[PDB]
């Protein structure tokens, strides 16, 4: 158990992270033609407006929450103590998770049972979406466990682990001592998504079109 503990929480996170980064770079340099969102909307517009919006708006809310929840150092401290952050995560994060899960399930039902989509899908699209649906569900299932420690003691452990990992401080797994198993699973599946990321459609995330908001409308390319 201690062996598996150090593997998944001290070793695996760096394997997943290395693969995520070098895999992204290598696919960007050698696979531009494969770098796309892979829209399937034209083949079947039914239910996509609701499903995709619920899923994306929901998962983006989760991303923002997770990002600032685990990466924001405790000193940045009096106004946002750990237990206040937890309440935010449970309610704001919970709401986003519900939106995400509903959208995700609708998208998965579509991918599996809509003839035109199922017929043109790749195995990776099914795998990656299935894992996201499961991860989101696991996420929501942690809420009743966090509710057992409204003082933020559990979150303090998870945030401690996350910050140790990203700052390359060994012994990260020790921060997780005593945390509920559900959180363990969530963390492992989450890191696994980073591992699979560069070999799936998730690479579209890197391409969020921020620069469009300030770009001149017309583009002309000179002789080159």
């Amino acid at each position: 158990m201690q062996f598996l503990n150090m593997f998944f929480f001290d070793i695996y996170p760096y394997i997943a992270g290395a693969v995520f980064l070098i895999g992204s770079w290598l696919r960007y340099d050698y696979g531009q033609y494969t770098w796309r969102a892979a829209s399937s909307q034209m083949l079947d517009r039914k239910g996509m407006n609701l499903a995709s919006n619920l899923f994306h708006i929901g998962i983006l809310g989760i991303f923002v929450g997770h990002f600032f929840g685990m990466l924001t150092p405790h000193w940045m401290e009096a106004w946002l103590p750990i237990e206040v952050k937890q309440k935010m995560a449970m309610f704001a994060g919970g709401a986003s998770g519900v939106l995400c899960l509903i959208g995700g399930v609708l998208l998965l039902k579509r991918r599996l049972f809509s003839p035109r989509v199922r017929a043109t899908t790749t195995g990776a699209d099914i795998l990656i979406l299935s894992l996201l649906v499961i991860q989101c569900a696991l996420g929501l299932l942690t809420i009743p466990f966090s509710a057992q420690h409204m003082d933020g003691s559990e979150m303090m452990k998870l945030v401690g682990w996350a910050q140790s990992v990203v700052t390359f401080h060994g012994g990260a797994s020790q921060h997780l001592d005593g945390v509920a198993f559900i959180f363990r699973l969530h963390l492992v599946l989450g890191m696994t998504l980073f591992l699979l990321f560069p070999f799936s459609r998730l690479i579209h995330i890197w391409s969020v079109p921020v620069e469009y908001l300030t770009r001149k409308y017309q583009l002309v390319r000179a002789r080159h």
């Binding site: 770009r215 017309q218 002309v220």
Partner: protein, 1244 residues
């Protein structure tokens, strides 16, 4: 690194533009190579399409990755004069999609054989070491023969090998020839102009062994019988470039943009030169989009409009204000001044035969063929026999020309047109009128079956002492049109508003076209022709030529052009466009295709009569000759079934026969020897006595039907085969969808020349062999399918009526999988046949019948009337009152060696055509050097015919169109007949010699040849009749001029001596079946028209996914919105169309442009794609020809009469089809009969 490049974000930003609206970037663009590398290819090869479209377009075939990937048009044709647009790029959508076939899912890769036939073939070979005897054991066993014939069109094809199929085919051929006769083996292939050598391949093999070569021009109804009738010419028309020289064009029943696509630009561009265009179509067709005026007469009533227009023209430009140009033209180039004898009737006279020199005392000084020389009066009241009449063509020389000279004194004379003002008296002549007859679907105008007109006449004292009244064709014509000339004729018009036989008012009732339009356009058309001296043209097509009375539609247009002197003048004339019938190097190709270099003659047959007979469509005939006779004809002299007229025509040498005799023609020589007399005399004696009979008399006795049929470059059973269900039943012996009862079941009148049996012989064909590159409907019903090379995988040549260029088909890559070119396929069959026939067939003697040929001295057969030797009305004289009886020696074991070498007859006899011959030794000497020669064997020392290129070079070297040396010798030969030099027409190109490899480099314009009537010149475009008008060469007609009067007995008695309006015939195919198999939905009868489609050329390309995607995804039928709504049919609904002949299934295309009353199923969507089961037949849905049936016309059977004499594809019965009516209804149950459990039901 593309990733690292992202950091050069700002550094790549150049200047902004348009005040911040734009940004210029300096970024990488290497990705653009992605599309550049797709365009890049290995090479381009010049090739064309062997399809019957008349396009004859040269393409660039792109090879990439060692495969054919796509094609784009060549644009390097020799440019036309500076004042004319050039031809490039030509092309069409069908052709642009051909590349799809090479590796498509419907490509034929290996030789295939019906499983049941293979099983028996191999079991038979195991008991019979000799394949001929193996075939016998199968075919002589009723149960075995039936087992594979009933499997036709029912799956079970299995992969075979060239060795296996070639042996079976050769064995079957030998057995058939040996036991029944060589003419029991036949081949069907059309339009050689699209791929000359490919056609020649099968025709050459068949001709060597004595098999019958089936015709196609008449069969497809592309042949306009009015052409031979009027000009003694199959078909000769101006090139599309010549349209640009016209200042007034009427597109009549010709959908130019859709059916003449690559040439359409000449039509759209000439408009910019000030040319006015008029479209005449019942529907708003594509052609209308391009014209200045759209006239929409009721379909099938066009002759009425043409008659009314001609009426106006004659009245205003010939009578009231005589046009100097028109008057002179008709005086010198028509038979109008010719004299016609009047026949005494009860109270009036009828127009009889034309006066002949032989009818007068001293025969007008003519001692040669006086009975074949027409007569007229000169301006000085003197009677004369002008030069040019057919009588001067043979037996003498120097007077067969159009010089206005006295055929006796050789002095100049001026012919008089009308007798009005010098007549001895006025006589009343009756004219037939049919405008009052017709079905309920067309408007009629009641007058009188016989219209009496006052004609100026003159009494003459004939040689036999008797006396007779005569009048000119001119006067007879004006009366026929209803022109009042001051004699106070009650049946003549007092004005254009007077409803009389043939006025604008009259035509308005019949056609529905406003009289003011008929008047305005007729006037503009004639006015233009007067101002320009004949530059008015009429482009006409199948819209008019596919009706039963196509001759009336055509003679109507033809008369308009003749009256305005448009025929023979660049920019004017009759522009008939249908199939690609113009194989320019004609006399170079004929010997190759029909093995005339080795044996003469071959066995040509007119297919309409052939199929009417063998597919037993005559057993269901509803049309009678009696109901077609003139009201002034002796009904008792024309009794019998329509087929009876054909049998009589055959025995009189008018039309060919096939099979020919009721006895194996290879056995007659032996019997003749034993009888102590030569074969010819023995045959004639046997025919008179009845010991030997024409096979046509007993087509179902078991020895008089074809047994082996080769089909290539044709989809006979899915495209051109009228009476589809009859072919399946009688030729194939499979299930069929015929709905009606035959003559016997109805207790009708049985023929008087043909035997009858209640249960007709079925499954007549023992072996059906089809060569194709795609599995067509015909392949689906064959016994053996042979994979042939596509047009992009073989060498050949192609020419067309549209332009004067000869170019090639070339192999871009060797044929894929196991495919072989048609030439190599037949060469291999010829090789196997040669070894398999040993011991069965050796040096045989064949007795071949040959009908009296047009353009041969024998065309002067029966001059004054029709005599039937079998009736004892005359002696049986082969070549005059019967067909020529020829002896042909065949060396069966040498078939292959002969096939692959140019025979000795070219050197021993020579070459020729169209009535002339020449020496071609120099050409054979050249060919020996180009093709090399046989080292030994039967053909030792003869030029080789090993490859398709060797064959192409033979064609090019022998033909006058492609060899200036031959061209001069050809024009020289003609000069002997006319007495006028014509060599000046080719002297300036006498050194020209077109070579196969040069045309691969650039298409080459051909040389002016006597084979045609137009010129290939750089100052004047090609225009038909140009040589007749400018070189004074006679048209090959009785009078030597454009013949307005058809005086042959049959023509007179069937009411067509002069053009007259004839309403669409009643096929009676609907009333007996409508409502008999109701599915609950309303049914309605509609006219079934089959104009040619936009998503294919016939059935070719019909299965091509590109064409199917741009079309409607499969078989569809066009209906008017009114008819569709009446029937409860929505756009794209499944519908069923049917009648007594069969049924078809398809989806509806509902449109406003289709007039109520008619339906259009574009011609050829065939039977292999997207067709559900039929609710009528309970079988797979049929095709457009499942609802048609062959019905011949007697006037098309006429022979032995100058211009009305036989010629392969020159004359014969035609496959008309537009008069057909069908029952239409929405389908209910949509069952696919495939066991997929995926059927539908259309509610209500």
């Amino acid at each position: 690194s593309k990733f690292l490049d992202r950091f050069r974000y700002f550094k790549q930003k150049g200047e902004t533009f348009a005040d911040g609206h734009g940004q210029l970037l300096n970024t990488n663009r290497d990705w653009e190579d992605g599309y550049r590398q797709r365009w890049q290819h290995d090479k381009i090869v010049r090739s064309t399409h062997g399809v019957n479209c008349t396009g004859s377009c040269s393409w660039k075939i792109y090879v990439k990755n060692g495969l054919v990937t796509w094609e784009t048009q060549q644009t390097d044709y020799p440019r036309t004069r500076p004042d004319l647009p050039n031809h490039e790029p030509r092309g069409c959508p069908r052709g642009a999609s051909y590349s799809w076939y090479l590796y498509s899912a419907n490509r034929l890769k290996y030789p295939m054989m019906r499983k049941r036939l293979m099983k028996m073939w191999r079991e038979a070979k195991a008991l019979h070491s000799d394949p001929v005897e193996a075939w016998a054991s199968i075919i002589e066993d009723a149960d075995k023969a039936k087992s594979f014939k009933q499997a036709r069109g029912r799956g079970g094809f299995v992969r075979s090998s060239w060795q296996e199929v070639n042996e079976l085919i050769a064995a079957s051929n030998v057995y058939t020839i040996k036991n029944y006769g060589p003419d029991r083996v036949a081949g069907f292939s059309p339009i050689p102009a699209m791929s000359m050598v490919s056609y020649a391949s099968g025709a050459r093999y068949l001709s060597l062994i004595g098999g019958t070569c089936l015709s196609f021009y008449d069969w497809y109804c592309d042949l306009p019988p009015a052409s031979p009738q009027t000009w003694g010419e199959q078909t000769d028309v101006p090139e599309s470039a010549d349209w640009y020289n016209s200042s007034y064009i009427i597109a009549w029943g010709s959908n130019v943009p859709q059916t003449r696509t690559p040439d359409a630009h000449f039509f759209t561009e000439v408009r910019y030169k000030g040319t006015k265009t008029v479209a005449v179509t019942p529907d708003y067709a594509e052609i209308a989009k391009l014209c200045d005026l759209w006239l929409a007469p009721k379909q099938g009533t066009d002759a009425a409009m043409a008659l009314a227009m001609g009426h106006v023209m004659l009245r205003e430009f010939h009578l009231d204000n005589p046009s100097q140009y028109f008057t002179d033209y008709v005086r010198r180039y028509t038979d109008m001044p010719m004299l016609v004898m009047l026949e005494e009737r009860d109270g009036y006279y009828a127009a009889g035969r034309m006066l002949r020199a032989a009818d007068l005392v001293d025969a007008l000084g003519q001692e040669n063929n006086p009975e074949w020389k027409t007569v007229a009066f000169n301006t000085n009241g003197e009677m004369v026999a002008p030069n040019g009449s057919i009588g001067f063509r043979w037996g003498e020389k120097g007077k067969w020309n159009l010089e206005q000279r006295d055929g006796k004194t050789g002095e100049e004379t001026e012919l008089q047109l009308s007798l009005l003002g010098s007549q001895d008296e006025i006589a009343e002549v009756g004219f037939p009128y049919f405008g009052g007859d017709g079905t309920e679907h067309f408007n009629k105008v009641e007058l009188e079956n016989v219209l009496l007109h006052k004609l100026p006449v003159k009494r003459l004292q004939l040689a036999d002492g008797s006396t007779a009244l005569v009048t000119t064709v001119y006067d007879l014509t004006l009366a026929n049109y209803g022109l009042e000339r001051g004699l106070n004729d009650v049946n003549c018009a007092t004005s254009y508003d007077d409803v009389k036989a043939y006025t604008p008012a009259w035509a308005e009732q019949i056609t529905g076209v406003s009289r003011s339009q008929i008047i305005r356009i007729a006037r503009e058309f004639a006015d233009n022709a007067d101002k320009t001296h004949g530059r008015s043209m009429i482009i006409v097509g199948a819209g008019l030529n596919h009706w039963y009375h196509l001759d009336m539609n055509y003679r109507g247009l033809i008369n308009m052009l003749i009256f305005c002197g448009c025929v023979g003048q660049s920019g004017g004339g009759w522009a008939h466009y249908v199939g690609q019938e113009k194989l320019r190097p004609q006399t170079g190709w004929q010997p190759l295709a029909f093995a005339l270099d080795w044996q003469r003659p071959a066995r040509h047959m007119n297919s309409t009569s052939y199929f009417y007979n063998h597919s037993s469509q005559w057993r269901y005939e509803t049309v009678t000759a009696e109901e077609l006779l003139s009201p002034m004809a002796d009904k008792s002299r024309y009794t019998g079934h329509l087929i009876d007229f054909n049998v009589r025509a055959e025995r009189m040498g008018w039309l060919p026969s096939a099979p020919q005799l009721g006895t194996n023609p290879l056995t007659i020589a032996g019997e003749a020897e034993k009888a102590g007399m030569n074969p010819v005399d023995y045959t004639v004696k046997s025919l008179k006595e009845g010991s030997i009979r024409f096979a046509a008399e007993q087509p179902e006795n078991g020895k008089n039907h074809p047994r082996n049929l080769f089909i290539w470059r044709s989809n006979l059973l899915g495209s051109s085969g009228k009476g589809h269900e009859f072919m399946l039943k009688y030729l194939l012996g499979t299930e069929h969808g015929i709905q009606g009862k035959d003559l016997g079941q109805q207790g009708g009148v049985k023929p008087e020349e043909v035997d009858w049996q209640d249960n007709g012989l079925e499954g007549k064909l023992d072996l059906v062999v089809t060569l194709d590159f795609r599995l067509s409907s015909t392949c689906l019903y064959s016994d053996i399918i042979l994979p042939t090379a596509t047009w992009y995988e073989k060498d050949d040549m192609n020419t067309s009526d549209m332009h004067p260029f000869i170019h090639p088909l070339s192999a871009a890559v060797d044929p894929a999988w196991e495919a072989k070119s048609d030439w190599e396929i037949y060469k291999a069959i010829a090789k196997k046949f040669s070894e398999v026939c040993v011991g069965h067939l050796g040096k045989e003697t064949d007795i071949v019948t040959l009908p009296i040929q047009h353009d041969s001295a024998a065309e002067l057969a029966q001059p004054l009337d029709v005599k039937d030797w079998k009736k004892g009305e005359c002696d049986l004289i082969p070549g005059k009152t019967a067909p020529h009886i020829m002896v042909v020696e065949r060396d069966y074991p040498a078939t292959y060696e002969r096939f692959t070498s140019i025979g000795p007859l070219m050197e021993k006899i020579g070459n020729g055509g169209k009535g002339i011959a020449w020496n071609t030794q120099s050409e054979m000497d050249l060919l020996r050097k180009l093709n090399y020669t046989k080292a030994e064997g039967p053909a030792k020392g003869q030029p080789m015919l090993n490859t398709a290129i060797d064959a192409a070079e033979m064609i090019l070297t022998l033909a006058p169109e492609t060899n200036g040396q031959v061209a001069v010798k050809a024009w020289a030969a003609l000069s002997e007949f006319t007495g006028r030099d014509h060599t000046h027409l080719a002297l300036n190109k006498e050194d020209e010699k077109i070579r196969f490899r040069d045309i691969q480099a650039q298409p080459r314009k051909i040389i002016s040849s006597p084979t045609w009537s137009g010129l290939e010149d750089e100052h004047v475009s090609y225009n038909a009749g140009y040589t007749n008008v400018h070189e004074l060469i006679p048209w090959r007609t009785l009078s030597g001029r454009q013949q307005l009067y058809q005086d042959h007995q049959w023509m007179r008695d069937f009411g067509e001596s002069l053009l007259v309006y004839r309403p669409p015939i009643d096929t009676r195919s609907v009333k007996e079946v409508i409502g008999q198999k109701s599915n609950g939905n309303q049914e309605k009868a509609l006219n079934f028209l089959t104009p040619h489609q936009k998503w294919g050329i016939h059935s070719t390309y019909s299965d091509n996914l590109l064409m199917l995607t741009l079309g409607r995804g499969g078989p569809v039928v066009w209906l008017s919105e009114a008819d569709a709504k009446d029937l409860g049919i929505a756009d794209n609904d499944w519908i069923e169309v049917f009648n007594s002949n069969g049924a078809l299934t398809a989806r509806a295309v509902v449109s406003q442009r289709v007039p109520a009353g008619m339906t259009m199923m574009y011609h050829a969507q065939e039977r292999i794609v997207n067709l559900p089961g039929s609710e009528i037949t309970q079988q797979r849905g049929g095709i457009h020809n499942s609802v048609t049936r062959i019905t011949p016309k007697p006037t098309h059977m006429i022979g032995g009469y100058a211009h009305l004499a036989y010629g392969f594809n020159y004359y014969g019965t035609v496959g008309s089809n537009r008069d057909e009516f069908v029952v239409v209804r929405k389908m209910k149950n949509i069952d696919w009969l495939d066991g997929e459990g995926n059927d539908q039901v259309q509610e209500s």
